[PDB]
Amino acid sequence: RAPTSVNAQEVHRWLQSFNWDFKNNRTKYATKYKMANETKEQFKLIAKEYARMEAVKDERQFGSLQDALTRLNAGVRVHPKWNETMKVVSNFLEVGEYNAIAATGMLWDSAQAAEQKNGYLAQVLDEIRHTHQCAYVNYYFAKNGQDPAGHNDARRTRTIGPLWKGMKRVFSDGFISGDAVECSLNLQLVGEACFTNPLIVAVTEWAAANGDEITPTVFLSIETDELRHMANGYQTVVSIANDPASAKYLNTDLNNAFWTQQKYFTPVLGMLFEYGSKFKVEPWVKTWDRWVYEDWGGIWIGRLGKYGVESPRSLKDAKQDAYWAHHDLYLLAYALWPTGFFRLALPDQEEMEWFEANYPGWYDHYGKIYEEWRARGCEDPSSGFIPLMWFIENNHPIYIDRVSQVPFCPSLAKGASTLRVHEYNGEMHTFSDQWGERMWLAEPERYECQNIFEQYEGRELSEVIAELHGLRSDGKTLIAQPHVRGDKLWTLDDIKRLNCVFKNPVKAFN
Amino acid sequence: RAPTSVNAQEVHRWLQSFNWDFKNNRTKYATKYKMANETKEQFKLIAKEYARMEAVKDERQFGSLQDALTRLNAGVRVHPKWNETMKVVSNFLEVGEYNAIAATGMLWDSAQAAEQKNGYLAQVLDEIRHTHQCAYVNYYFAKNGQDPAGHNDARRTRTIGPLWKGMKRVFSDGFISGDAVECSLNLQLVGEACFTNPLIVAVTEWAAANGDEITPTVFLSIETDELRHMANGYQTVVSIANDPASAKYLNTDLNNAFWTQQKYFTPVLGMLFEYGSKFKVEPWVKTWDRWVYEDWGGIWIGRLGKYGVESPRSLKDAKQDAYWAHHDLYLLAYALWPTGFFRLALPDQEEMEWFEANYPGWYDHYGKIYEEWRARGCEDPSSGFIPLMWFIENNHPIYIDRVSQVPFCPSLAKGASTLRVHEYNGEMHTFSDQWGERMWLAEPERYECQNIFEQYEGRELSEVIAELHGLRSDGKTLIAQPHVRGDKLWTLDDIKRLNCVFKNPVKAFN
Amino acid sequence: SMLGERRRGLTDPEMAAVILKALPEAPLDGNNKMGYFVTPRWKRLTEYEALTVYAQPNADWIAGGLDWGDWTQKFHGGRPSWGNETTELRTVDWFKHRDPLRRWHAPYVKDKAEEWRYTDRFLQGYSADGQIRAMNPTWRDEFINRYWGAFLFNEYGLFNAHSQGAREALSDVTRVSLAFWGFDKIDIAQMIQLERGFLAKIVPGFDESTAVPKAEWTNGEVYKSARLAVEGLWQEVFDWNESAFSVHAVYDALFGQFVRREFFQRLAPRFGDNLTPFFINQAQTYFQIAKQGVQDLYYNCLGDDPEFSDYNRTVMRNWTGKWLEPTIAALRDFMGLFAKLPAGTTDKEEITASLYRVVDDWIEDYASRIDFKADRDQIVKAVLAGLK
Amino acid sequence: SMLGERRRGLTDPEMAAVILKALPEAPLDGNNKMGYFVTPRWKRLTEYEALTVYAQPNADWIAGGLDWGDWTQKFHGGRPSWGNETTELRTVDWFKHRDPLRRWHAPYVKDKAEEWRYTDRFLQGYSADGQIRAMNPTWRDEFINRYWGAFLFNEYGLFNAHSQGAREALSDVTRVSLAFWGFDKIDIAQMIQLERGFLAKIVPGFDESTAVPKAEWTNGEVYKSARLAVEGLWQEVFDWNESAFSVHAVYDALFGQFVRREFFQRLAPRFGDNLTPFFINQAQTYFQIAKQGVQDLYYNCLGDDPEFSDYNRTVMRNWTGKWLEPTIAALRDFMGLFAKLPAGTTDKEEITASLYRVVDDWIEDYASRIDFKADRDQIVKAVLAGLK
Amino acid sequence: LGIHSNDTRDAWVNKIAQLNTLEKAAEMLKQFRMDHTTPFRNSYELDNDYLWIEAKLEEKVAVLKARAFNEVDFRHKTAFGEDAKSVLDGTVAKMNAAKDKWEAEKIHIGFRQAYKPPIMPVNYFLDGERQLGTRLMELRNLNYYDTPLEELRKQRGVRVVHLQSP
Ligand SMILES: Oc1ccc(F)cc1
Ligand SMILES: Oc1ccc(F)cc1
Ligand SMILES: [Fe+3]
Ligand SMILES: [Fe+3]
Ligand SMILES: [Fe+3]
């Protein structure tokens, strides 16, 4: 008659047995792989205990936000550039987290072993937690920050710009569209392990350096949940290593997942970090080299070699294209600044020294371009100038990769300067690398995403911005801006003045 | 089958009927008043709802503390002087909160109406919460601060010094010993309404000014509970306002309560504020006047007039003795620094200017003395000088009021300098004011508290400190110090080598 | 070091001043409400709505979506990441749904966490109070261990039926509700196991192994049709709405409510069992919580859709008829369990009345909402045939 | 403004710079453990002990005290703030006590808040699930609205019995436990009323007023003897320990445990009432929680005191006898309640089996601890002598 | 050798150990309280240790009284054989028959010095405390400030040794 109870592991010991056999007990999704029926999970959790450990984390997180951080005015005392960066960082990750919800629901469907299902189940709830956490950062910055615009409506204002398209590739469609296993590689084996986990921590560093204590509070909490997602991605490889098909397709799917993720995050994360901050933490190059080459290409991939896992055959090219990618992209992001939901800034003198110091040759190329644009009055509303024009006058067309959605300018880029243009059944397609090209050639019906130039063709710039609600609450001032100062903000009419009309750059080819 | 429930207010409506009449259904404590059995409380709470609103508060508080505040190293980036000040503020207030537990318990026993008993009960629980909250502050600063000594053992190291004796009078014995109603006035009608409630907010103000975000996080949370204690002290007067004994005894216990509390806090609080900090919020004089006269003595007491309550007759006297009280006390506190469990600092240049500016005449008196002591080496261990010596040399006796326990030096004081000495049945008694003298003459058996000189008589200084554990971890360095720098800390030996032996100052009249 | 090496922009004097100097004099927009453009269900926009609605990146070609264009990457063959083709139901806006309990992740795990910790406190108090002594041994070893135990597989199967909807739901609000309906189901299955595990600790000889309950589920007669229905709902239905609707508005509303409430909750007390009712209280609380979401989605939003109301009711009516039969069959076989009780436990009249309660609650709460014509005595009569 | 006119030392460049310049290279003492001088009851010092032990400013003349000298202010007459004169019990240290559950304010209100919020959720589920339907109209309107309710005044009385202890307790650790033991008791009393209030909202003619249950308590014969025991424990005892010990290690352990467990907890189910048992689950969880504190105080600390072990046991044995008789009486008058029950509800065979459980448990958990040799058969005999 | 542990305190731990008679111990305590407690104590020589000493005696007196009395007695009979309820009712009478505060205060204090536990049972003691104390306050707090300090000092019978007020 002594006080006794039962914990999670005591019930979990019998969870594997919850599933039973029957003819139609099989996954509803197409797949080339067969997940082992006796696969097991790393953490012995049940719904009750999962809820409890997450609830404890929430107490601390929301406690800090609602009380001390609010009393300290932490929502305001952040560098302007970083407040803008978090509009993109938090909302884009929000979609990654969100799609990861459906992604893991699909893995949970694929798994046949009760334990492996339960492992993914925990992530399904985690991904919902993460969607809401990311949404909370934008919610908090909109309520307490220096510029709510964009933070308060990214879910619809993000649709105006080209950067959003590539995001839905690697953190949306790339998570749920295809073979469940392929989707798992994009999400867990590559996405999280190589980029997300190291990314979340890196973001908290850049945040603190720029006065932001909101993001560290939330993201560091999200990070404590990533242990379980690492085990899931790892068990996916283990649950299929004993299948003959694994030796035929595993490396192919891994290589594609690798390139898919890298193609977008390599240039976009670096851009957000170095151009979206005042105080620098570390040059993107060495950060990348450590993540992709050491912490992943060697450490993480080596451990899975015992299951047939090899090193991505495109890893070489990825590195060769990496170094300048983010620099190449910011020129485009700034040139197309009117299509965003955030405010951008030209590098200041102190920053140009930093860039040039860590990337020799940066000034003779990018530095001078920015200086010219400044001279042309790119920051001034009465200049009647937008960098896009500069690309027109100098014959530097901007294309959109049919596959990755990543914008590129081959005649100006220091990284990949390749361009492949094809015509197929009455349509034109532009590719930026040999891997994306193979993907489309072999899987045309998987990549039909229409690009902004295609959808906006013949439309006057200001009309597109107005239609998609790219304005602030005054109904006249643009959410997006070419500078982060508090005065002289471009208005919808300042864009109208300009009478800029979109054109599809691929129509020039005969 | 509509979803239905029941709230606190719906159950509380019948709480009053919970009690029932019968022979010995009466208070167990001596009182001169008769609390009506039909008295009602303002907040209709039941145990469960009370726990909920408090729990929600804890969540925010502890979340901030364990998360964002720790990540920001809030326990360290606080001014040295304030880190020391909080050892006293938090622990001294803790005993107040703790005896308030017994007081409301005694009050709960006094009340006859179920609702009035319920009111006091809510506070009984609140005070327990406040005890633990204050304890958590010292615990947090001990765990993460720049100097744990004192914060880590105040509960025993506070027994060495004289300032603690007076605290027990106003926040311990004053709260529980005597007529239940008298104790209520000291606790809720005077102490809480005139000092504690306004104080707690003030403390967070000074704290914030000095880098302390910990105390604000906890004290502001304690503040949210005070609106209930105010209602309790108010309902105490309402429940006895119809009793004939009220018109005959009320204003007497109240005046005695007012004098008792102000006697201690007037000099002590101002001292902690102005001398225990680097950055100033507001001159204590201006603060005192607003609290004591306007807020309390004006608006608060005025609303109780309809219940036969009048302004303490000792009001004008208190305002008279107030101006220099805190300045006079710090001289004694610093002179006796080896008896504390905290480190004191002498006013720096900016501070002396601040003092003179707000207290004309301050420099020619206190300022010159402090510069004399410093030049003589009161801060340096190798000087062999402790300011107490200066008092002996210039024949300036320091006495302890037999009633309030407040230290006073009539020959040097700039404020009150009255002194009454009496002998009764072989014992000498020293009094600092006419009100305390009357209290003793009328109730000799209520005030037999031995003072430090009496208990330490004949004892060599370092012997008292070692016995009461006034040491840091190394077993040699003193917890108390005459400066707040990191080097040249005084050791037990530096004290022993001086051969300071305590003497009972009253024997000079023999 | 006491201060650390990393300097923070919020507290570091030099960096903060650089930051403070670049700050505008006031916010660059006074609209500080994230999600301000969302149509509020209630008087004012709720935190639940702001943090949830439109998180799903749907384009306008999926009713209610704000984005534009095709998905960036689709399945081999062309199937879209999300699309209209995954369900027979149609609506003017997939984002209209609202969980009446407004549950987003934080509130959800908070409530479940409280229930968990209190459950632990409850069990320790139960074992310490030695209440197990007055419980009928037969009820304990036969009906709780085997029969209540076998039911966990029923709940588990229903949990699994939600796996495809978690992947295919056409909006964030629906995905979140569905995920929570399924998570609550697996929680219940685990609470059934938890009880068995607890009994094995305070009852000498009680085996917590699932072998007996599982064999009852996979090969017994009592739950035969229940298992066939569950296997069907889970693996033979590819439409995420047919799954959620049929599970909660047909099968669980009739079979599950009967088993949990009219059998175990109703009879456990008669055998000195206050333990099982403790867990059934949770299961029933969860059922009523889900019912609110289920009614909002299928009746308030889809069944009453301004453009597809008639269409949706026709379809749901179709699904009710399709799953009412297997559900009646499951109840019919379950009737066999009454013959196994000790004589005098209950009688045909009590059993019939309890069936009418479940059928009448179903008709009022579900069937009538889509004008499905249900004959209560016909349904009850068909089930009673199973009484041995 | 956006920045606020108030500069904070942690974030203001100028002020923080001054702060940082004054800081020492490292902490001036490596002992960062508050309460490091406290003697741990377990392996390592717990947060509960640090935040509680020695908060009470007692001087050495009160066993365990660390301060010195008399109180500063006392009662007219000379009565000390706290003194050895308030209780017959003596010990080497009043700070030895430790609540096994280690409850300081925070954990306490956290747990109760969860129970409150779940309770609300449960009630909304019960009412929505129409579980009330299987409820016996008699039991509801009679045994619940009259005899159950009346029991609330019992708990309420035991609540007030703690008032003096909350004022006279001789230590922080004992004062906090006592306060929680009493606060839990009034909680239960309010829960009893909560249910009567809930029933009122779902039962058309059910009257929530305490009028009936009160009169039954003040004039009834069922509790009459029990009400007399309460009045005495509360208003006739001026010894805080005698009050705590007797109330928890005698009266409530016998009469209370019987009325709650052996009567309502064992019968309410039989009348289709799972509502009441939901609340009794709480009250019993609380009882077992308080029990551990009571045991540690009077047995582990006082009863086994290295210097007053024999002395204290003598006083507790004395107190046991003193209150064991009024307790027996309270029970007898309660036995006259089965008579109002419909025939068949229960027989003397059961009533006897239950009584022996209470007594046996009581003897096993309390009586045998202080060597109060008692006779189970005699006791049950005296109580049983109250049946029809 | 001072605050908590000193020669003088030790002297009494030995002096109390030689007490093995409820009679003797009860007597010594009684005398002790008359000699060192309250403003009316016979002397102040033990002022710094009396509170601690007195407790150590209450201890010896308690242990014995328990091993000497019986169930019913230990609850209603003082250590002097007196009948608690009787004494209580007696003192309350004298108190309610007190002409003034000066007389009342003497009754109350005297009551404590004689019947403080382990002498009188706690139950009756504290109950008396509630009644006696109530009377004392009622007389004392009536027109509390009418008597001027000069006259009040003479009433208390205090020996004024020094006064100064600017
Ligand atoms: O602050 C920013 C925001 C977006 C971006 F692409 C770069 C920097
Ligand atoms: O920081 C302090 C601490 C004690 C005191 F009395 C004054 C200032
Ligand atoms: Fe995630
Ligand atoms: Fe993840
Ligand atoms: Fe308080």
Ligand SMILES: [Fe+3]
């Ligand atoms: Fe208070």
